[PDB]
Amino acid sequence: MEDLIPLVNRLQDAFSAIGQNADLDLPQIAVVGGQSAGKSSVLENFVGRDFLPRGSGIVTRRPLVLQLVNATTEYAEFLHCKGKKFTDFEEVRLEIEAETDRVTGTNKGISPVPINLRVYSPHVLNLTLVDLPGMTKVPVGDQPPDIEFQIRDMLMQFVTKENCLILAVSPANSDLANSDALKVAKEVDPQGQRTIGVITKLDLMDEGTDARDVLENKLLPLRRGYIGVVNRSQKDIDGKKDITAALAAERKFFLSHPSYRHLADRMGTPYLQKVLNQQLTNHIRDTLPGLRNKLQSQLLSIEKEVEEYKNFRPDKHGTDSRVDEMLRMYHALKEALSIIG
Amino acid sequence: MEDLIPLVNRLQDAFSAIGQNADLDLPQIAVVGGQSAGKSSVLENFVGRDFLPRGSGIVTRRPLVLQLVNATTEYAEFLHCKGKKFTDFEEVRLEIEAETDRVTGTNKGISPVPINLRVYSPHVLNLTLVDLPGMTKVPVGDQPPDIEFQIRDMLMQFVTKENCLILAVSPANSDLANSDALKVAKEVDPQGQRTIGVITKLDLMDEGTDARDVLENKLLPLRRGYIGVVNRSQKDIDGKKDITAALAAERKFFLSHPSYRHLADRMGTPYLQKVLNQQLTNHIRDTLPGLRNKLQSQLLSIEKEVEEYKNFRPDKHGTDSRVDEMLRMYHALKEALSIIG
Ligand SMILES: Nc1nc2c(ncn2[C@@H]2O[C@H](COP(=O)(O)OP(=O)(O)O)[C@@H](O)[C@H]2O)c(=O)[nH]1
Ligand SMILES: Nc1nc2c(ncn2[C@@H]2O[C@H](COP(=O)(O)OP(=O)(O)O)[C@@H](O)[C@H]2O)c(=O)[nH]1
Ligand code: ALF
Ligand code: ALF
Ligand SMILES: [Mg+2]
Ligand SMILES: [Mg+2]
Ligand code: NA
Ligand code: NA
């Protein structure tokens, strides 16, 4: 898939250029759950550049479709800043925050229009993650009275797609039965074919309690199971603790907890990355046919259009962006197919 | 207040015995909130003795209508345990658990049939509380697919009534925007005229965070405000820590917390109890004339019912349970009205 990401990118771009942005339905992974369950924190571990805004209260307010591509040098590009190469990750964070404010148009409200960000790095896996605002029940500040439903609708646009894997995130310090994540995952993926349970904040459970029943997949079983994680507290985020230290603490936590130690090797952030990648690879594998057919269809249709061409014969000027983009689309589709088996 | 409490209690018992509470609208305080928010822990503190089943997972599974009466001696009586008196509160706890299992089983189901309990004590206020199962989002164990709806329907029968104060319980370790309590409270009491917010588990918040904004009534303002409490942990419970020690720990908590010290005098369990009592007293003084009119109407209704039953069962001139049941309501209404001059 890493081999055709280059093409699909040229594809989406040519489509966006003519204002049509195609429904490629490329495999991606979206985090769903209640507000501040720790979703952005789970996704931050796949990048480690601190640009994903985290925090209690409402922070994520727009979907962030983050494409990670393994490359030799590190840089980022936003689809809305075409032509710009970001090398400063602090600037990447500021842009996410400024863009969030610009489109939401409010202090605490949301907007379902996604922020599209691509990050090239020699430290990342090849995949697309979608960070999403957490579900709520009552509005605060300038949020609309139907905020709970706007947020749910926003998530539904992603999770109702067959190609979107679901990271159902639930915090350990709330009974699982209260999980907004599991409720939505069951509704859209009754069979659990694409739901992976993630249990965060295990370090915050009330003394004398534990999530053993949940972690052993017995309370609310999921085919893909549940993986517990322990991410940075607000103190540690403000304190600048890095991922290496947080990962060491998480390992120690699981190795030392009397209720989880027998499960340690299938717990933790590194394990989640391993499993997620495997599930994604598998999904891509069994869903490839559908993608190739989509491409074959778009190609045939485009060929019909292109067949009746002879665009600009005169000198230099006489610009025609539409034709140029149809040609970029045409060529991208063919290269995509030659790679797509 | 004017000690009409015994009269209202006897009246409530008369209707409760035959499941006819839908006909009344008596003053009481009902607790609403998500599962395991600490609702039972809050109510139990009114008595100061351990007697209510508590814990993570679903524990309260039937409504508990708890009549507290100030008296020289301490003991309890259940409406379903005819002629028995309990002075061992652990036996009271076991009875609630047994009577709950008798109707709901031990496989997680609930039932809206109330357990009616009265506790006499020199340490309690004169008022009635209603403990209720916390709201959920996804079924578990042998719970039906619509368990969320069944639980919300059950509490709705209590909180939709005009004379029912609403104790909106939210745990500090979840963003307030996630509050099941506040959502339902705002749905039945939009102007917050009879809603009191309680924030539990302040001792469980993530390091580097605090609930100052909510406790100052700033994050999501409530007409009657918010009061924070710190109840016992599961480990405290297991270690047999009593209520008096929990109270000491709670007082120290607010006085020593840099974020709450300036609000300490308006924080804590005894303050919450003082406030609820004042709010209820205020509510009753205001609703009394209407209560008088409703009881007068019910009296006329019951008299006619007794005359009509006479026709349904001209009888062998003996005595059947139905007439006794009806005369019990009749006398309770008359006696209550005598006090409500
Ligand atoms: N102690 C602890 N804090 C966590 C954990 N995960 C997240 N947090 C904190 O919870 C808050 C919410 O995190 P965030 O990732 O913004 O969740 P999101 O709103 O769901 O994206 C932040 O203050 C994080 O520091 C965890 O596993 N343990
Ligand atoms: N640490 C701590 N634990 C609490 C607090 N309030 C309740 N709990 C615990 O939370 C669990 C649920 O308590 P419970 O009263 O049964 O809540 P209910 O289900 O909502 O009635 C129990 O394990 C309690 O010990 C609190 O303020 N602090
Ligand atoms: F900031 Al959030 F769910 F509360 F991403
Ligand atoms: F046991 Al509960 F709300 F979870 F009373
Ligand atoms: Mg987030
Ligand atoms: Mg309870
Ligand atoms: Na947040
Ligand atoms: Na509970």
Side-chain angles (χ1 to χ4, degrees):
Chain A
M1 175 63 71
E2 331 105 276
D3 300 338
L4 80 157
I5 283 293
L7 277 306
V8 177
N9 283 349
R10 311 290 178 204
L11 273 173
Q12 162 144 329
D13 299 338
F15 257 93
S16 63
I18 58 170
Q20 201 179 303
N21 204 72
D23 294 59
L24 284 136
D25 306 321
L26 307 171
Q28 66 191 3
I29 298 158
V31 286
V32 296
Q35 171 167 294
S36 289
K39 306 180 293 306
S40 295
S41 292
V42 164
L43 298 186
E44 171 60 26
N45 289 321
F46 289 87
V47 244
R49 299 315 255 218
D50 285 317
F51 65 68
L52 250 42
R54 282 143 296 149
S56 53
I58 189 167
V59 178
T60 308
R61 293 185 300 133
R62 288 183 64 193
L64 176 74
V65 175
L66 169 62
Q67 195 198 119
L68 304 179
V69 176
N70 189 94
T72 201
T73 55
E74 204 153 27
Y75 66 94
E77 69 202 10
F78 286 95
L79 202 60
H80 67 277
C81 296
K82 271 185 179 183
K84 179 175 189 180
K85 195 143 103 68
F86 283 77
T87 52
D88 185 341
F89 284 109
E90 247 308 285
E91 207 50 48
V92 168
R93 186 181 72 76
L94 278 34
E95 185 61 21
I96 291 173
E97 194 178 316
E99 259 305 295
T100 293
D101 168 83
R102 183 182 74 80
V103 181
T104 61
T106 57
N107 192 228
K108 296 188 173 184
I110 59 86
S111 164
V113 183
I115 294 180
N116 279 280
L117 172 66
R118 296 182 177 135
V119 170
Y120 295 82
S121 164
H123 304 303
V124 303
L125 247 43
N126 290 298
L127 64 194
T128 304
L129 310 170
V130 183
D131 196 5
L132 293 171
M135 282 169 275
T136 65
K137 309 191 183 69
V138 294
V140 300
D142 62 6
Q143 293 176 160
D146 70 341
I147 183 65
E148 161 176 8
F149 311 109
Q150 285 193 216
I151 289 176
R152 200 167 213 271
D153 283 1
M154 171 164 44
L155 320 182
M156 294 293 270
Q157 306 162 164
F158 287 94
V159 302
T160 54
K161 300 180 209 165
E162 294 309 304
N163 335 75
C164 177
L165 297 195
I166 303 158
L167 242 39
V169 183
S170 308
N173 57 354
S174 178
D175 283 9
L176 200 70
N178 297 325
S179 180
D180 295 277
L182 291 168
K183 179 180 182 181
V184 64
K186 258 77 164 63
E187 279 183 24
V188 306
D189 177 32
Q191 313 318 137
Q193 195 282 141
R194 53 192 176 92
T195 298
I196 299 86
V198 177
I199 303 300
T200 60
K201 299 186 172 182
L202 283 149
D203 56 318
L204 302 182
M205 291 190 79
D206 185 35
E207 281 305 305
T209 67
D210 66 78
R212 194 180 177 165
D213 290 331
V214 176
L215 301 164
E216 296 184 336
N217 207 28
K218 299 167 177 168
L219 189 56
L220 205 68
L222 289 180
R223 277 162 61 183
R224 311 286 176 223
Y226 293 80
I227 298 164
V229 295
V230 178
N231 284 320
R232 282 163 299 179
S233 58
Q234 186 57 229
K235 169 176 78 70
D236 289 329
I237 281 182
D238 295 347
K240 315 300 175 176
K241 186 170 183 181
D242 57 21
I243 287 187
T244 300
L247 291 180
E250 175 188 64
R251 180 65 170 142
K252 174 175 174 189
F253 175 84
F254 287 112
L255 286 171
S256 307
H257 203 296
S259 303
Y260 312 144
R261 61 186 177 213
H262 64 291
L263 309 171
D265 296 337
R266 79 166 207 248
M267 296 285 115
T269 299
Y271 188 66
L272 175 57
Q273 177 165 326
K274 170 189 168 182
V275 170
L276 254 180
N277 195 41
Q278 189 59 68
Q279 289 306 303
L280 188 62
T281 290
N282 285 2
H283 198 88
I284 287 169
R285 175 203 57 200
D286 51 58
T287 205
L288 222 215
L291 215 298
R292 77 167 173 80
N293 282 306
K294 288 166 193 158
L295 263 23
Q296 290 173 284
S297 294
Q298 280 268 209
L299 188 264
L300 177 277
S301 174
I302 292 302
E303 288 185 326
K304 292 182 173 299
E305 246 283 321
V306 173
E307 174 67 57
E308 309 179 302
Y309 281 2
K310 188 178 181 59
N311 42 300
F312 204 65
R313 307 198 315 258
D315 296 63
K316 45 189 172 298
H317 47 273
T319 310
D320 195 328
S321 299
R322 192 186 66 83
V323 73
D324 289 329
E325 302 299 336
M326 285 294 259
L327 290 175
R328 277 173 196 117
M329 287 173 47
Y330 170 70
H331 292 115
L333 256 351
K334 296 182 301 81
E335 289 172 53
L337 273 310
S338 58
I339 299 176
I340 214 171
Chain B
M1 300 73 251
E2 293 78 69
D3 270 293
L4 70 174
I5 290 303
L7 281 302
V8 174
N9 282 176
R10 176 177 302 113
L11 175 61
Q12 184 166 56
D13 278 2
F15 283 68
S16 293
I18 67 183
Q20 263 184 235
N21 300 268
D23 296 335
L24 307 173
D25 181 11
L26 304 177
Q28 52 189 194
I29 302 169
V31 63
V32 299
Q35 183 165 294
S36 291
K39 306 184 297 304
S40 298
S41 294
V42 166
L43 297 188
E44 181 177 69
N45 288 340
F46 276 80
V47 173
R49 305 265 295 223
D50 299 349
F51 74 109
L52 293 181
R54 323 204 315 295
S56 297
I58 183 164
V59 175
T60 307
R61 297 187 292 143
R62 288 177 66 184
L64 178 80
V65 182
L66 175 61
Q67 300 165 346
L68 304 187
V69 178
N70 188 91
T72 299
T73 191
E74 195 159 53
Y75 69 97
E77 302 181 313
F78 286 96
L79 190 52
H80 76 272
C81 290
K82 310 168 186 177
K84 212 67 60 174
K85 297 191 179 268
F86 289 77
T87 59
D88 183 333
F89 285 80
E90 168 53 15
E91 280 293 308
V92 173
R93 196 186 66 71
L94 291 160
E95 183 56 29
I96 290 164
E97 172 176 270
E99 177 58 22
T100 292
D101 294 342
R102 184 181 75 78
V103 181
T104 66
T106 60
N107 53 342
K108 318 300 186 181
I110 52 87
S111 149
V113 183
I115 291 179
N116 296 289
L117 174 55
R118 180 161 50 250
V119 170
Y120 291 94
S121 169
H123 309 306
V124 307
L125 296 159
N126 296 100
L127 42 73
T128 301
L129 305 172
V130 183
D131 198 11
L132 295 160
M135 289 166 265
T136 65
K137 293 304 188 171
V138 298
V140 68
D142 279 3
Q143 294 176 340
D146 67 337
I147 188 65
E148 174 180 354
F149 174 86
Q150 279 183 219
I151 288 167
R152 179 175 183 288
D153 187 67
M154 160 172 47
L155 63 76
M156 284 299 281
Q157 309 312 298
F158 289 89
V159 302
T160 46
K161 295 191 180 179
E162 305 291 333
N163 292 335
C164 185
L165 287 208
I166 307 170
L167 195 49
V169 181
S170 307
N173 57 359
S174 181
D175 278 14
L176 192 66
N178 287 329
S179 186
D180 307 72
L182 292 182
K183 180 189 179 172
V184 308
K186 290 179 167 293
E187 284 174 313
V188 311
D189 177 30
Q191 306 297 64
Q193 284 287 2
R194 56 192 172 92
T195 294
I196 302 184
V198 176
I199 297 298
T200 59
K201 299 184 176 186
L202 286 145
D203 58 319
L204 301 186
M205 301 188 76
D206 187 40
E207 291 183 322
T209 72
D210 63 72
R212 183 171 65 86
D213 295 337
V214 2
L215 302 176
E216 283 184 349
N217 205 26
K218 290 166 172 164
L219 182 58
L220 207 168
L222 232 40
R223 173 183 289 276
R224 305 297 185 208
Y226 293 77
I227 296 176
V229 295
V230 177
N231 309 305
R232 288 169 300 178
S233 58
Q234 186 58 53
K235 180 58 106 73
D236 286 346
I237 290 180
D238 299 336
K240 314 309 185 184
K241 184 172 183 175
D242 62 29
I243 290 189
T244 300
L247 259 20
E250 168 192 75
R251 183 182 195 179
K252 174 68 170 187
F253 178 86
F254 291 111
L255 288 158
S256 296
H257 201 295
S259 303
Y260 316 138
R261 52 164 63 259
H262 61 296
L263 309 175
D265 63 323
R266 287 178 300 146
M267 289 287 119
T269 295
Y271 178 71
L272 170 56
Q273 292 167 200
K274 180 171 62 190
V275 167
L276 282 165
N277 179 251
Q278 186 61 79
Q279 297 302 123
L280 185 61
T281 297
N282 284 179
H283 198 82
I284 291 174
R285 161 165 285 177
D286 290 5
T287 56
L288 242 197
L291 174 55
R292 172 184 161 273
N293 292 151
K294 294 184 171 74
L295 298 192
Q296 282 169 342
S297 189
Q298 286 300 117
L299 184 64
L300 288 183
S301 177
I302 303 292
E303 285 185 50
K304 179 183 284 286
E305 210 174 314
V306 168
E307 291 189 30
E308 261 149 34
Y309 190 79
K310 189 178 310 300
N311 302 324
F312 181 60
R313 291 286 174 265
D315 270 310
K316 207 77 186 84
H317 299 328
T319 297
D320 58 4
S321 303
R322 293 274 296 117
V323 69
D324 289 342
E325 283 162 19
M326 287 180 286
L327 287 194
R328 186 184 176 173
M329 290 185 283
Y330 167 78
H331 292 305
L333 281 157
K334 264 174 58 63
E335 290 180 51
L337 284 160
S338 299
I339 291 282
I340 306 179

